[model samples]
Target chain A: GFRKMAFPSGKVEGCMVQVTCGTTTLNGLWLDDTVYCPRHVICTAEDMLNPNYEDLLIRKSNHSFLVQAGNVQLRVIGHSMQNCLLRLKVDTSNPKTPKYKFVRIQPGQTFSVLACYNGSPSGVYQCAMRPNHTIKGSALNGSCGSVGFNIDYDCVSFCYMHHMELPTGVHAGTDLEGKFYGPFVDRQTAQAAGTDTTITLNVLAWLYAAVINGDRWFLNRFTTTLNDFNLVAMKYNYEPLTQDHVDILGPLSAQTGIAVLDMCAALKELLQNGMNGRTILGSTILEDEFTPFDVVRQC
Target chain B: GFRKMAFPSGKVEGCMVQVTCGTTTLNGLWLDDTVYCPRHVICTAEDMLNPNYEDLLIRKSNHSFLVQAGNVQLRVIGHSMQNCLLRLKVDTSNPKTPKYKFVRIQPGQTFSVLACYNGSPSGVYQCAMRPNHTIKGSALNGSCGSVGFNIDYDCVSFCYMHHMELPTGVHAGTDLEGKFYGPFVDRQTAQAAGTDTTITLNVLAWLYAAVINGDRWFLNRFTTTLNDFNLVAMKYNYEPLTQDHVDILGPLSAQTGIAVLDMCAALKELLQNGMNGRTILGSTILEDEFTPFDVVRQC
Candidate 1:
């Protein structure tokens, strides 16, 4: 998760400048003592142009100008090396570091870091941090700056068993009550292995997939089937779908044009209410809010 | 992924019957020879009503009529088995096995398999499969059929590395051609350790988050930055987002009432086009279609 920042403002004294062309503005940095630009081109007002004006112009026309402004090297993108746009930005956030942006690619696209110097497109080099990989001339490294890519996301799902506490005093022999249900196996093997959680997780995973996939036929039946799956603290109970209800709806689902996975995704969106908020998206268990609701009752 | 199916029709000879309640049919099997029901109540027309008529009636009124129909135990759900409905179904799919469902829970709901006998609600027993867990009277087991619960789900994300083919003739020194870009480090230690994939995976994971999250500001810049991320055989190429475009659209994103992860989910939905189909939902790479488009261009 590291990043190579752009060159900040204060680091370089003289040639720090901004270039404008037909409403297009490119940030420029002068890493060397000398600076050169086309006579007709608009540049920083305070800075004097380099003495090799005609030579620089000829080089530009030839598309082979300004590789090295003395020891200061400038880099460009692509093999063409022609029609190079000196796009560079100094990191205004921290001017102390000699960092600069060579070029910015579009969002979601791959990028190559380029090194630059003295407002000139110079030569590319290897990533010093990783010598095997050649660096680009447009990339800012060495005396300039460096570029880095970072990866950040959550990958914790498979590491732990998601769990919910059973009602207190509830165990293997517990009868099905409003607070607890019967037959939740607590075998000696299971207690020792602690594999019941895996079993629960598996069931939850299947059910979750079914729920998110919007298997309405299954969901309706599932709601009804889990009729007594009530927690004492819970405050809702409704007329759960019954076998009769399922029988009636089963035939109707056949007429719908909805595709399989589409329906599942749609159902997830629907249940999740537009993929927003704190959704139980990839979760195994159903969120409390997603369960059956009965406004006038308490479970 | 295991299931306890209903009893097959062949196990019991004398009491295998079907009860119809106003067109609602219930599958029933007599585990014992003797069967009992209210004289006025309709049951299988063939069954001989039990001789203990008055006593059974008094017991029914007390909500404690039948726990065992002669060693043929019956189990009911809930403490108040007062309105006990003998809802049973035989697994017609297989006739050799003796299994039955005492009640039907809606799909997606927790279920209790019950044991039945001689068409009577019997006493609940312990799950022989897991003795620590109590068994349900409605669950068919012992002399009849056994019940089982199974869990099945896929959990393979955090276990392996996902990879793709980089263009041939590409390595640390390879210049940014149509296929490979430089600075992909192949450190001496890294080559032996083989961690380059992790680095790519990390960068890709971050980009993936941005794409799925629909951060257009970042997406556009990413696209332009990865200008040379094209795969040789990969056909499409297009104008990638530049930094200027990002600056223009950056402020507009702030106005949208769209929330955060919701946006990410939405963006995932958007880029993913829907949750349906074989979506690369949790994957770390962008699919072919989700890239820049330059019909007339070749990268």
Candidate 2:
């Protein structure tokens, strides 16, 4: 239930700059007035519920986002200030004369929009507040970027459940397993509910040139162990620990089988390196001679 | 669900060494012909189903020689062996016709008596195997030690539920608190099931140790901050990571309390040493009428 997204390199020149959260914006515009929160304080999307960072992902090749309120989207490189629009594409006949919301987000202080409903096709769009009692954009394109992308900010209402460790006193069942053993992550949605082993991921991009390598071997090896691993998978990971599944196996099939070729390959590989350092049919180590006990053993 | 026993220091001389599981030690003797079990197997108190360090415990104390088993009683230091006997107290209204089944236990090969029952109470009894098996007598005393103790063994069907940590690859909710928090002691028994930061004592013991020390200050300090200290009592001592609780709530609450004039007397001593080698308090070249103005002040 996890995926890593990568944006191929490209350039959208003659566009506006972007503001972001951290040290990597190759040159995203950043306002000097950024406020700092020292600890983990929960943030909610305009949807007024639990939110995850994935849904608001700003796609780009890299460096700093040079980068919200409902699905809030803010832009930089554009030269002039303009109205912030919440675009809603209309349905058939009434068709495409898109409905536009010119929202006024006064700069400074806080601005908010509490909505009981998402726009028509199930969405809300927003962006940054500028200098005057308006939002940021261009007189040239009426929006941040005409078509290509640069760095920008966006908030999403990808709601989900989550918690932190060591609240106060330790309770009986408190253990390392309980933490990650019960979360859910929605790859496209940027919403992670929780983890069975007990965890949550960070929502940020990097400026460092060399991306730190991550431990993926565990995932690659997949499943094969006992107890804690088995138990948690069924309960937290398999109970379908994410967004309550809400629906189900309306239909089901009972079956059990292993990939014969895969198993044969696996069995073959054991004798691949042979007993000592040689192959089963051997000359120190012949590539093709590495049979699992060899074809002769079939007799 | 547990009990501790104790015994006194002494040796039962010239007594036949009698092996027993419990009440009716019918018979299960052995010698050289004993067979070995290939694996770690369970042994029960029955040959009446397989069954001695003869630790002659005659416990009456409450702490060490003070402890042995639930029902403690024993003795040794005898030189000669004698005849074995299983005493039976006649039930009410029925003066007992003591039944004696003298089974022979040879001194060498292998002895036998695999009873189907536990006897009298409910038991299994065993001993070293000896073929001709006319159980030994001190020829001098007629047995191993005439009711004395030696070095052999005994088994009891006293198995209970228990768990081992890190059974495979994981440990239980053990994060200190999962560790300290839920542990309950056999309270009334005063033996805590669970510590330094986490602890307690028997009501009876502390009650007396105190009447013994009685500073009774928290008692006099009155309600409020006093009891939670002296009440729910020992439990939460286990919460704090504060190495500080490591010092006064450190000299600790010695089964006692003190107040008022008790404190006034404490005050009288500070001034007693005077401006000598000692200051207003401990030794220091100081104290020039160091009033708590130097020493005393009021808002």
Candidate 3:
């Protein structure tokens, strides 16, 4: 039962959600009472804030959403872009008959089980491979057209002692526990870390850094991506198969096209299923139309 | 001898100048290395920031300009509305006559006294009887179109300990020593302090409080006064008898007309006698056209 998950601040606390959807995934780490971009996939100003392409393929099915807190993890699978994913995680080691059954959602349809606490879901979070080919967490507003995540309980003290104590004005942290603070790694630095290794950023912090330092190069890149994303969410009804979709095509088709199409399809499904306009991201999920989540809390 | 009176900070420090220019005078006090309107007159928003008028009469010739630091005081008198006042103060008891004789300045004449440090005058501060009938110190720029003053040497520590030690954001202090920090009194409190007593304010602080706190009542009053003062200064040429002067009449005629007119005359005299456009107040003093002074430092 989700009994009004309220913290001292109406904001999320220390809970990290590490999700892997398809070949590309950037985790969401909790920082300063807010979920930030997970540390991974160091996309540069050129990527439009999205991941690079496998070009060879992509998927709208074989989708999965996982929420973890403490030792408990809930996993949902067997969902397509046109429907919301709903399933719970069961460790094979202790796979006794599960209690809560899954609610199946099909294309262009909705199934109303019970409403969440206050008619809202719990810890429903999502991360997106930006339609612009970059990756970002939910903005400070919790709109995760960028990488986004949420947690069930408070662990602010743990996170702060772990990384928040970093000097003010330095936008750096890690999702991995026991990691100390340092500045966000630039592409060169991230490359030096390892071949496949990359650095990620909190959407809000990156934007802050961009504006404060007048990093107009990156600022223009992200803002242009955001503007296009806005058009997709609003004008296209979460269906990215229109002229507007084609306009931002080059990168979308090259890198994030398949995932974005899938996410957009799934977003429309959630809307048809009475998910309302709002999502784990800040406002109505229909607006961003990319990676979305709903923390299903059964009372 | 004023030998390039340079302090660590070009701004003035601890010295307080208490002038009794007339029955109504607000002295100039030092605070935070800057000159601020001194303590005295408790003009309210109703008065447009000037002292109340005697109505009986006033003088453009019985004018005096005095500069003091420590126990030494320089007094200049016998100046009309068109010339600058230049003289030295001498105590009556020891009266060894005086080393420097008085310089008599007549009407519509020009006098070129040696410039002060950097070809400028020293402590040539002024406090105006706002044509709109208000009093203000020189602004942060040192234009005392309001109540303004300046001094020699740096006594920042003295002033800080004296009154600047007040809690931050408080617009309160005193020119008198031994006094402590407290917020400026409101009109009610000022009136309650004594029958004929009143509270004075630093021009900057008063303006700050008005803006920060949104005390638009007083803000409007002061701004309206400032707006009118601006016109009087620019269009009238430091002479108050023009049609431009008639626009902001009522209050000026009733409360501060005499003092303002006399100050304007003296200011024009100052201009004719080689006083460049600039005044003790910040920028060109001629623009303000009211009570002005030139510190005569004998090197």
Candidate 4:
């Protein structure tokens, strides 16, 4: 007879089994048939000779641990100080160590960090934070997790473009060079009828008449012309030729290189006689009375 | 009765009695009235020298001679060729000559004498007519007399005073040593305000400001100030001091001495460093950014 094995539902299992039974024969009454079997079947056929099957069982588990905090918040609770300061800490036991360092928040202030630890193998490491009190009302806070601490640095910006030290301002690219830079357009009109030579001659005649007539206002008005003429005459070897020319040319030639007239003859005559001939003649004619002694004494 | 001598009144009576007299006196005598030839008839002696009864005759006559006209009058006429010439002559053979020669008459003009000559040797000479062709046609004729040619010469008569020349026009007093005399109030004012310390300070300050500001009008105005200040300060030290002081202090101090307020410190600092420092600072701040490395590195 074969015995039945019981199995639990909702769970599947596999096992090896062996069975033994007796079979009746036809002949007579007292004949008994005996069948024998071992407790478990043993095939021993080289252990079924199956090739090794590499059944790679890939199992994935969704597990996460925080590396570092993303955003940090801080509030300043004290009076303003002269310089900025900061304090920070980090958790070294975290599997991933985040970079933690202090940066200068203000010009005169700096941030710093210290390592905090607890003896218990499993405990939340709280980072104690403080801002440097050099500057007033500066707030500082840090972040910690699998990664180390992080800090938000605060600073006061200033413009030091003209300061003795750190003469350059905070930002670059603002300096300029050279004299005043601007665009100008020439609006001069073309001459209508006369050449520059004619214009110059006319101006010279006007100046001569003005000076001769002792027109002070006219002379003052034309001073720029005088200056220009002087500048030109100094730069050139021109000579004033006549009284009018000399009136306009002498000073001009001394100052500039241009010559409106020839002064050489007059100058030579003056150097020789120490007096202008015209002046002598004019004075003689003006004072017409001749002393009898002056004429008779000569004889 | 004694025969009386008849004198010719209108014309000489023909052959009545032609008697020529020479310094003699005539007296009448009674003929033979006293026939008494007595001893007393010897006729008492009478005085012969003329006391009061003797007739004495004195004869007088005026004589004239023709004078040869020479170049003396020719020269006088030659003066008439020019404007404002006077020529005169005197006849010395008379009582006194005329008091005036011609006055303020033009050249080449003629004048004639207007006196009569008597045939008698004892006649007195006198000028009895007026001169002609006076320039300013006034009564210049009888104004002269036999007073020896002392001319009352005048260009023009005004309120008993005479002017020898006409009033001059523009630039009348310009010529050096010309006979244009004046009593200038302006010159007097200048003399009155001479050499004041406060005036000197004001003038120096004005000049400095004028130069720095480049105000030409102000400069011209202050030029007088400078001149006055220099003249005044010269009295104290007899040499220039303000100009030397300003030169010692340089442009910065010059500007400060004038009391201008802008950019004083900047100008002072700039001048203190001299041209090299200015060049360096100007190159750094004005042209390029200054760096510590740049400052440390000297070339």
Who wins the TM-score comparison? 1
After superposition, candidate 2 runs with Cα above 4 Å error: A1-299, B1-228, B232-299
TM-score of chain B of each: 0.18, 0.18, 0.19, 0.13
Q: All candidates' lDDT scores? A: 0.23, 0.18, 0.25, 0.18
Q: What DockQ does each prediction reach against the true complex? A: 0.01, 0.00, 0.01, 0.00
i-RMSD per candidate, Å: 34.8, 39.6, 31.5, 93.6
Cα deviation at B205, candidate 3, in Å, is 39
- Residue A182, model 2, lDDT: 24
lDDT of 1 by residue, B133-206 (tens): 11112112221221211111111011000011122111121111111112222112221112111111112223
TM-score, per-candidate, Cα-based: 0.16, 0.14, 0.15, 0.14
Instruction: Say which prediction, candidate 2 or candidate 4, comes out ahead on TM-score.
Output: 4
After superposition, which runs of candidate 4 have C-alpha atoms over 4 Å from their true positions?
A: A1-203, A214-299, B1-205, B211-299
lDDT score, residue A136, model 1? 16
CA-based DockQ, model 4: 0.00
Fraction of true contacts retained by every candidate, in order, equals: 0.00, 0.00, 0.00, 0.00
Higher-TM-score candidate of 1 and 2: 1
How would you encode candidate 3's per-residue C-alpha lDDT over B1-299 as one tens digit per residue?
Answer: 10111111112212334333434333333222222332222233354234332321132232333434335453433322111111123222222211211122212111111101211212221222222222221111122111122222221222211111111111223222323223332222331111111111112212222222222222111122434543544543332243343333333334322333333333333434534433222112222221111111210
Name the lDDT value of residue A162 in candidate 4. Answer: 8
CA displacement after TM-score superposition, residue A190 of candidate 2 (Å) = 16
